[PDB]
Amino acid sequence: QQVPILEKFCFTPHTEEGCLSERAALQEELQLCKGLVQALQTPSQQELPRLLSAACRLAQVLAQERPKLPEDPLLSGLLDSPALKACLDTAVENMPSLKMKVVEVLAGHGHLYSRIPGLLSPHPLLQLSYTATDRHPQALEAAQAELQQHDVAQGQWDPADPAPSALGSADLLVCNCAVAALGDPASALSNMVAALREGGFLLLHTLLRGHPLGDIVAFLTSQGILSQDAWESLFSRVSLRLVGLKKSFYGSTLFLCRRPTPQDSPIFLPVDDTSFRWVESLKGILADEDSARPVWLKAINCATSGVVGLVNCLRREPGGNRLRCVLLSNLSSTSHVPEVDPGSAELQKVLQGDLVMNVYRDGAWGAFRHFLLEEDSKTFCPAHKSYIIAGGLGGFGLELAQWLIQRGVQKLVLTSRSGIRTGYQAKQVRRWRRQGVQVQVSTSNISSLEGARGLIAEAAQLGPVGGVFNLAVVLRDGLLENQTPEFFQDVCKPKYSGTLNLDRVTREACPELDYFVVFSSVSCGRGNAGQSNYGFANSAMERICEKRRHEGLPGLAVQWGAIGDVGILVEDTIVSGTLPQRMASCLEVLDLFLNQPHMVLSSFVLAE
Ligand SMILES: NC(=O)C1=CN([C@@H]2O[C@H](COP(=O)(O)OP(=O)(O)OC[C@H]3O[C@@H](n4cnc5c(N)ncnc54)[C@H](OP(=O)(O)O)[C@@H]3O)[C@@H](O)[C@H]2O)C=CC1
Ligand SMILES: O=C(c1ccc(-c2nc3ccccc3o2)cc1)N1CCN(C(=O)C2(O)CC2)CC1
């Protein structure tokens, strides 16, 4: 009995402020801590309140309680929040392989070993080597159980010194210096940079002077607590580029920085051409194995480009290391579209960061990130409305049909270019009809506007159209070297065209539509070698659903991992470290997912 990992997939600005606003417990604790300091000058059992309360009666006291202080909910707020995961997933996404070597500085008071390995462990392919270091062996003695549980190696490193050889060519260095003292920050950071490979990341958690929490801790302990400007000056000083910034409402901060790489001349390739002629171009560019020139796919003219899913798949193929993209994707027609031509300022910023994923949406640069879903109550359907499944005679289609009938659907149109071709398809339609369900098998093809209009018309004869579900798929798997514009056309027709055509027809003629649902893939969400065209097609549908939801229309894309029992995959097999999700699991997840306000959801099952 298997437990899927359920996530939302959300546009995430590189820069976020006001983080942890909604968290009333931190809002309350801060107000209390502000009073207790206001009292010294003139959540209450938590460490920083308890320490401030002990200071009101009266150096010795805090020295005892310093090892307990990092786990104060304000001090640890950003760490136990989606901001940490966003920063980590950004590093992983920018690795040349699925091996990340991580080194924690001053782990003793840092405690990032108790979060980072666990945040990354649910990833099926990622090979993590995490080393918790500190200046004294005594520093990490209390945590020895947690280090073993999380498979964390141990090291001795005072960041005042050069790093031990062992810890060199690190991919990511992490340091929670909320409580731990770097000493001379410029020296510390300088040594931390040298320990990184070129293009390696630094993730620093700290408190900002000029913000309530830093000023409170600053006042209490009287090098130390720096302003944002000082930190950002220090990053430039040691030649780091700030590529991500997460600020809590009380001035706790995650800085995501990157050591620059000597950049060869970039190749720009527009991937907006609806004929996919750019496929042949890209093939010739990546065919040159000699070339280490980075390849920048530009989607600037089409908000529904699937470039992101494309990139995820091509990064898994030979020469994939080289690939980056720019996507302009405003949900609002009122939003400014920035100029990103070679000379421009907006592009130079993107190039300096050199991130794989550069998505511009309604004023901010960011990327789509995955976040653990919250809830993890059975749905029911209006019995008078018609329900359309494109690809309805498929593996997942026949199960989705049954599942809709169990929830009160009496009016189904199942679309298929070739109609009933198996005895199972024949048996199921015949049984449902016997059961008094109106089941139309239609060859009307959503790939064209005509077919889509025909299909809605057919549905509308049964009852007003309540739901459309795009489960249509054509596969043309192969590495890019064996792809053609025609193969891309074939894979995109049922999904991109199909979803565009349904979008437009349901807008024009389905005012009673409750459900617009497309079945995307982990192949798009995470990437799969040999499926770049499928990556793109699924990614486009997701961009359509986001747009629809922004205008208040129904829109949900579901990124399924492998499906068991029925479907393409089936026609016990661990797949890229995942189990095919059993159909009973898929269907109870879909109940959860259908009554959810998020635009793109993900479900996959991890192999143990
Ligand atoms: N199975 C899996 O492991 C996974 C599936 N998914 C997604 O889930 C969905 C269901 O896949 P699954 O049931 O496995 O696949 P199947 O191949 O079993 O069924 C898909 C059906 O789509 C039909 N189809 C293709 N193009 C069109 C079109 N233009 N109009 C109407 N019908 C069309 C095909 O029939 P015909 O040839 O007669 O047109 C086929 O029967 C797909 O969107 C897929 O991408 C995602 C992740 C994993
Ligand atoms: O080979 C995989 C595969 C690839 C990668 C992963 C995976 N990578 C991850 C990274 C991080 C987190 C979770 C992750 O999961 C899981 C499975 N398939 C089969 C095909 N497939 C399809 O859709 C079809 O082509 C049949 C239609 C999708 C699944």
Curated annotation (Swiss-Prot):
NADP(+) 2 binds at residues 386-401. Transmembrane segments: none annotated. The modification Phosphoserine is found at S44, S265. It comes from the Eukaryota. It is found in: Cytoplasm; Melanosome. Ubiquitous. Prominent expression in brain, lung, liver and mammary gland. The modification S-nitrosocysteine is found at C325, C586. Residues 377-608 are annotated as: Beta-ketoacyl reductase. The modification N6-acetyllysine is found at K495. S-nitrosylation of Fatty acid synthase at cysteine residues Cys-325 or Cys-586 is important for the enzyme dimerization. In adipocytes, S-nitrosylation of Fatty acid synthase occurs under physiological conditions and gradually increases during adipogenesis. Fatty acid synthetase is a multifunctional enzyme that catalyzes the de novo biosynthesis of long-chain saturated fatty acids starting from acetyl-CoA and malonyl-CoA in the presence of NADPH. This multifunctional protein contains 7 catalytic activities and a site for the binding of the prosthetic group 4'-phosphopantetheine of the acyl carrier protein ([ACP]) domain. The relatively low beta-ketoacyl synthase activity may be attributable to the low 4'-phosphopantetheine content of the protein. Homodimer which is arranged in a head to tail fashion. Interacts with CEACAM1; this interaction is insulin and phosphorylation-dependent; reduces fatty-acid synthase activity. This is Fatty acid synthase. It comes from Homo sapiens. The lineage of its organism: Eukaryota, Metazoa, Chordata, Craniata, Vertebrata. The gene is FASN.
